[PDB]
Amino acid sequence: EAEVQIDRLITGRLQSLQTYVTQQLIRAAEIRASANLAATKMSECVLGQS
Amino acid sequence: ICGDSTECSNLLLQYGSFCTQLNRALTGIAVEQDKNTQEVFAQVKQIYKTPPIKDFGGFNFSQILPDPSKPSKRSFIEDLLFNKVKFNGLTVLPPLLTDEMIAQYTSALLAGTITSGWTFGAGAALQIPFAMQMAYRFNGIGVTQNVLYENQKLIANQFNSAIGKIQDSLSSALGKLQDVVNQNAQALNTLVKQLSSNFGAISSVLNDILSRLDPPEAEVQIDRLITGRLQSLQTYVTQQLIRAAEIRASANLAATKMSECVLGQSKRVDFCGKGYHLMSFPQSAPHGVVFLHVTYVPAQEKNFTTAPAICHDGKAHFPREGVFVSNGTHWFVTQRNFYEPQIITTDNTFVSGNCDVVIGIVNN
Amino acid sequence: ICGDSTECSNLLLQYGSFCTQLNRALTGIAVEQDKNTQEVFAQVKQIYK
Amino acid sequence: EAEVQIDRLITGRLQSLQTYVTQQLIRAAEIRASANLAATKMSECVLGQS
Amino acid sequence: ETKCTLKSFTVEKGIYQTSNFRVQPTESIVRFPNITNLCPFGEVFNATRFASVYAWNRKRISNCVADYSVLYNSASFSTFKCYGVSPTKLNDLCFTNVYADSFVIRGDEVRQIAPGQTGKIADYNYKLPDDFTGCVIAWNSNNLDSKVGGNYNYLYRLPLQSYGFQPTNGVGYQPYRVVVLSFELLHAPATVCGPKKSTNLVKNKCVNFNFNGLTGTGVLTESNKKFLPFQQFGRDIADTTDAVRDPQTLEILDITPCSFGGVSVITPGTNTSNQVAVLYQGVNCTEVPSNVFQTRAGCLIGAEHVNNSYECDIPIGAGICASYQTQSIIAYTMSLGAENSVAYSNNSIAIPTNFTISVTTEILPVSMTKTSVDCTMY
Amino acid sequence: AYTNSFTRGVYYPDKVFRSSVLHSTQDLFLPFFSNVTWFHANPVLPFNDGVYFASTEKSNIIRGWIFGTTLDSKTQSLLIVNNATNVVIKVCEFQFCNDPFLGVMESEFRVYSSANNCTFEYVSKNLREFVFKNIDGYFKIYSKHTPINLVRDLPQGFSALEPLVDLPIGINITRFQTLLALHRSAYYVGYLQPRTFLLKYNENGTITDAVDCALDPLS
Ligand SMILES: *[C@@H]1O[C@H](CO)[C@@H](O[C@@H]2O[C@H](CO)[C@@H](O)[C@H](O)[C@H]2NC(C)=O)[C@H](O)[C@H]1NC(C)=O
Ligand SMILES: *[C@@H]1O[C@H](CO)[C@@H](O[C@@H]2O[C@H](CO)[C@@H](O)[C@H](O)[C@H]2NC(C)=O)[C@H](O)[C@H]1NC(C)=O
Ligand SMILES: *[C@@H]1O[C@H](CO)[C@@H](O[C@@H]2O[C@H](CO)[C@@H](O)[C@H](O)[C@H]2NC(C)=O)[C@H](O)[C@H]1NC(C)=O
Ligand SMILES: *[C@@H]1O[C@H](CO)[C@@H](O[C@@H]2O[C@H](CO)[C@@H](O)[C@H](O)[C@H]2NC(C)=O)[C@H](O)[C@H]1NC(C)=O
Ligand SMILES: *[C@@H]1O[C@H](CO)[C@@H](O[C@@H]2O[C@H](CO)[C@@H](O)[C@H](O)[C@H]2NC(C)=O)[C@H](O)[C@H]1NC(C)=O
Ligand SMILES: *[C@@H]1O[C@H](CO)[C@@H](O[C@@H]2O[C@H](CO)[C@@H](O)[C@H](O)[C@H]2NC(C)=O)[C@H](O)[C@H]1NC(C)=O
Ligand SMILES: *[C@@H]1O[C@H](CO)[C@@H](O)[C@H](O)[C@H]1NC(C)=O
Ligand SMILES: *[C@@H]1O[C@H](CO)[C@@H](O)[C@H](O)[C@H]1NC(C)=O
Ligand SMILES: *[C@@H]1O[C@H](CO)[C@@H](O)[C@H](O)[C@H]1NC(C)=O
Ligand SMILES: *[C@@H]1O[C@H](CO)[C@@H](O)[C@H](O)[C@H]1NC(C)=O
Ligand SMILES: *[C@@H]1O[C@H](CO)[C@@H](O)[C@H](O)[C@H]1NC(C)=O
Ligand SMILES: *[C@@H]1O[C@H](CO)[C@@H](O)[C@H](O)[C@H]1NC(C)=O
Ligand SMILES: *[C@@H]1O[C@H](CO)[C@@H](O)[C@H](O)[C@H]1NC(C)=O
Ligand SMILES: *[C@@H]1O[C@H](CO)[C@@H](O)[C@H](O)[C@H]1NC(C)=O
Ligand SMILES: *[C@@H]1O[C@H](CO)[C@@H](O)[C@H](O)[C@H]1NC(C)=O
8 A C-beta contact, residue B93 and residue E328: no
Reference E277, options E50, E7, E15, E81; nearest CA is E15
Residue numbers of the domain that contains F105: 2-219
8 A C-beta contact, residue B139 and residue B337: no
E229 three-state secondary structure: coil
Q: In this structure, what DSSP letter does residue E88 have?
A: G
Cα–Cα–Cα angle for E130, E131, E134, rounded to 5 degrees: 115
Give Cα F12 to chain centroid, integer Å.
15
Separation in Å, CA D30 to CA A22, B67, B243, E351: 15, 43, 13, 48
CA of F116 to the centre of ligand 13 (A): 8
Looking at this protein, which amino acid is placed at residue B13?
Answer: L
Contacts of B268 in chain D (CB under 8 A): 43-44, 48, 50
Report d(CA E165, CA E147) in Å as an integer.
7
Give Cα A13 to chain centroid, integer Å.
19
CA of F17 to the centre of ligand 15 (A): 15
CB distance C39–D36 less than 8 Å?
Answer: yes
Q: Return phi, psi of residue B197, to 5°.
A: -120, 150
Q: Which bound ligand lies closest to the C-alpha atom of B363? A: 4
Mind spelling out the 3-state secondary structure of E263-279?
EEEEECCCCCCCCCEEE
Cα–Cα–Cα angle for F77, F78, F82, rounded to 5 degrees: 145
Query: Which of B302, B303, B304, B326 to probe ligand 2 with, by most ligand atoms within 8 A of CB?
Result: B303
Chains F, A in contact, 3 or more Cβ pairs below 8 Å: no
**A31 to chain B, minimum CA–CA distance in Å?**
12
B31 three-state secondary structure: helix
8 A C-beta contact, residue E191 and residue E99: no
- Read out DSSP for E131-173? T--SEEEEEE-HHHH--TT-EEEEEEE--EEEEEE-TT--TTS
Report d(CA F178, CA F100) in Å as an integer.
9
8 A C-beta contact, residue F157 and residue F126: no
Solving technique: cryo-EM
* End-to-end alpha carbon distance in chain D: 71
E166: left (phi over 0), alpha (psi -120 to 50) or beta: beta
Minimal-distance CA residue of chain E relative to A35: E366
8 A C-beta contact, residue E228 and residue E245: no
- Read out DSSP for B319-349? ESSSEEEESSS-EEEEETTEEEEEE--TTSE
Separation in Å, CA B39 to CA A22, B102, B256: 28, 12, 9
**Partner residues linked to E211 by β-bridges:** E214
Minimal-distance CA residue of chain B relative to E215: B207
Q: Are strands F51-53 and F127-135 parallel, antiparallel or unpaired?
A: antiparallel
Separation in Å, CA D21 to CA A41, B180, D25, E30, F191: 35, 20, 6, 49, 44
- F117 pocket-lining for ligand 11 (C-beta < 6 Å): no
Report d(CA C28, CA F122) in Å as an integer.
61
8 A C-beta contact, residue E258 and residue E283: no
Contacts of B238 in chain A (CB under 8 A): 22
- F202 pocket-lining for ligand 13 (C-beta < 6 Å): no
8 A C-beta contact, residue E207 and residue F185: no
Contacts of F18 in chain E (CB under 8 A): 234-236
- Element containing residue E332 per DSSP (H, E): strand E330-333
CB burial string E333-350: b at 16+ within 10 A, e below = bbebeeebebebeeeeee
Under 8 Å CB-to-CB from F136, ≥6 apart: which residues?
E184, E186
CB distance B241–A23 less than 8 Å?
Answer: yes
Q: Provide the 10 A C-beta neighbour count for residue F194.
A: 9
8 A C-beta contact, residue E76 and residue E139: yes
Under 8 Å CB-to-CB from D35, ≥6 apart: which residues?
C36, C37, C39, C40
Residue B104 exposed, middle or buried by CB count within 10 Å (0-12, 13-18, 19+): buried
Report d(CA E341, CA B53) in Å as an integer.
13
Give Cα E89 to chain centroid, integer Å.
17
Give the number of domains in chain F: 1
Report d(CA E355, CA E1) in Å as an integer.
53
* Interfacial C residues in 1-49 facing B (CB < 8 Å): 11, 14-18, 21, 25
* Interfacial B residues in 52-81 facing D (CB < 8 Å): none
**Entry resolution in angstroms?**
3.1
CB distance E352–B126 less than 8 Å?
Answer: yes
Give Cα F133 to chain centroid, integer Å.
9
Cα–Cα–Cα angle for E303, E306, E309, rounded to 5 degrees: 115
Looking at this protein, which amino acid is placed at residue B62?
Answer: S
Report d(CA E103, CA E54) in Å as an integer.
8
* End-to-end alpha carbon distance in chain F: 29
Minimal-distance CA residue of chain A relative to B14: A12
Task: Return the half-sphere exposure (C-beta side, CA atoms, 13 A cut-off) of residue E306.
Answer: 17
Residue B67 exposed, middle or buried by CB count within 10 Å (0-12, 13-18, 19+): middle
CB distance D44–B271 less than 8 Å?
Answer: yes
Separation in Å, CA E218 to CA B195, E204, E251, E258, E285: 18, 9, 17, 5, 19
Chains B, A in contact, 3 or more Cβ pairs below 8 Å: yes
Q: Name where chain C breaks: residue before each gap, C-N > 2.5 Å.
A: none
* Strand spans (E) along chain B: 47-49, 276-285, 288-296, 305-307, 310-312, 315-319, 323-326, 331-335, 338-343, 349-354, 362-363
Report d(CA D1, CA F136) in Å as an integer.
27
Sign of the Cα torsion B241, B247, B251, B257 reads positive
Sign of the Cα torsion B30, B34, B36, B37 reads positive
Separation in Å, CA B105 to CA B14, B283, B286, E17, F116: 50, 10, 14, 30, 90
Reference E60, options E35, E34, E97; nearest CA is E97
Shortest CB distance from C17 goes to which of B193, B199, B239? B193
Which atom in ligand 5 lies closest to the alpha carbon of residue E75? 12
Q: Provide the 10 A C-beta neighbour count for residue E295.
A: 20
* Residue bearing the CA closest to ligand 4, atom 28: B363
Minimal-distance CA residue of chain B relative to D47: B269
Reference E196, options E37, E41, E61, E85; nearest CA is E37
Report d(CA E72, CA E61) in Å as an integer.
18
Task: Return the half-sphere exposure (C-beta side, CA atoms, 13 A cut-off) of residue E224.
Answer: 1
Residue B144 exposed, middle or buried by CB count within 10 Å (0-12, 13-18, 19+): middle
Helix count and strand count (H, E) for chain C: 2, 0
* Residue bearing the CA closest to ligand 5, atom 17: E74
The answer to whether residue E317 neighbours chain B at the CB level (below 8 Å) is: yes
Separation in Å, CA B35 to CA B29, B69, B121, B245: 10, 31, 21, 13
Contacts of B32 in chain A (CB under 8 A): none
Alpha helices in chain E (DSSP H): 2-6, 68-72, 120-124, 142-145
Shortest CB distance from F205 goes to which of E58, E184, E228? E228
Report d(CA E85, CA F218) in Å as an integer.
46
* Residue bearing the CA closest to ligand 11, atom 2: F35
Shortest CB distance from D7 goes to which of B200, B269, B271? B200
Residues in chain C: 49
Looking at this protein, which amino acid is placed at residue B355?
Answer: C
Give Cα B39 to chain centroid, integer Å.
12
Cα–Cα–Cα angle for E314, E319, E325, rounded to 5 degrees: 40
Residue F89 exposed, middle or buried by CB count within 10 Å (0-12, 13-18, 19+): buried
Report d(CA D35, CA E333) in Å as an integer.
43
Residue E255 exposed, middle or buried by CB count within 10 Å (0-12, 13-18, 19+): buried
Helix B99-116 and helix B18-41, axial crossing angle in degrees, nearest 10: 30
Reference E40, options E72, E67, E75, E78; nearest CA is E67
Mind spelling out the 3-state secondary structure of chain F?
CEEECCCCCCECCCCCCCCCCCEEEEEEECCCCCEEEEECCCCCEECCCCEEECEECCCCCECCCEEECCCCCCCCEEEEEECCCCEEEEEEEEEECCCCCECCCCCCCCCEEEEEEEEEECCCCCEEEEEEEEECCEEEEEEEEECCCCCCCCCCCCCCEEEEEEEECCCCCCEECCCEECCCCCEEEECCEEEEEEEEECCCCCEEEEEECCCCCCC
**E164 to chain B, minimum CA–CA distance in Å?**
39
Reference F139, options F66, F46, F42; nearest CA is F66
Report d(CA E209, CA E200) in Å as an integer.
10
CA of E282 to the centre of ligand 9 (A): 12
Under 8 Å CB-to-CB from B147, ≥6 apart: which residues?
B138, B338, B340
Q: Provide the 10 A C-beta neighbour count for residue E373.
A: 10
Separation in Å, CA B154 to CA B45, B164, B293, B334, F135: 35, 15, 19, 22, 82
The CATH number of residue F137's host domain is 2.60.120.960
Under 8 Å CB-to-CB from A42, ≥6 apart: which residues?
none
**A38 to chain D, minimum CA–CA distance in Å?**
15
8 A C-beta contact, residue B49 and residue B114: no
